[PDB]
Design a protein around this ligand. Structure first.
Ligand SMILES: [Zn+2]
Length: 164
């Protein structure tokens, strides 16, 4: 009932409490938290063993991965506020629609979400249904229909309704 960004991106991206591998031969942990592009698993559990504070073998708790996720969004939007097109309209919505933006940011990337120039600015004038249906006309929406429909519904309502 009390949803935050980290949980909704656990619904859509996926949370793993053990170290895995990103799609290019690179370990990860949690929700897309990259450590290094090296094969040294000891360097893996050493970067993890130095970022968490407890020395473990690559397994953490669900509340310690949320820490690293909050770091990842605190740097992600540190990048958003340096992108000229993502900066304006983000400063215009409510917290949950901003999370709906950071989700796509972490899904495709800064220039990826920047491409929806027309779709982004109708959110500024708060044209929820129009920007929603225009966002539904995307290859993004077609290659992963489910998640995109969730994000677009939160762009519409500005609520966590679609994730319950
Ligand atoms: Zn309109």
């Amino acid at each position: 009932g009390s949803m935050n960004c980290f949980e909704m991106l656990r619904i859509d991206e996926g949370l793993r409490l053990k170290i895995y591998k990103d799609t290019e031969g690179y370990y990860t942990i949690g929700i897309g938290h990259l450590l290094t592009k090296s094969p040294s698993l000891n360097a893996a559990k050493s970067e993890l063993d130095k970022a968490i504070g407890r020395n473990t073998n690559g397994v953490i708790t669900k509340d310690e991965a949320e820490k690293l996720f909050n770091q990842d969004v605190d740097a992600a939007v540190r990048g958003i506020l340096r992108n000229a097109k993502l900066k304006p309209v983000y400063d215009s919505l409510d917290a949950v629609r901003r999370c709906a933006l950071i989700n796509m940011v972490f899904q495709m990337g800064e220039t990826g979400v920047a491409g929806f120039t027309n779709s982004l600015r109708m959110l500024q004038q708060k044209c929820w249904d129009c920007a929603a249906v225009n966002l539904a006309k995307s290859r993004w929406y077609n290659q992963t229909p489910n998640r995109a429909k969730r994000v677009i519904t939160t762009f519409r309502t500005g609520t966590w309704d679609a994730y319950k």
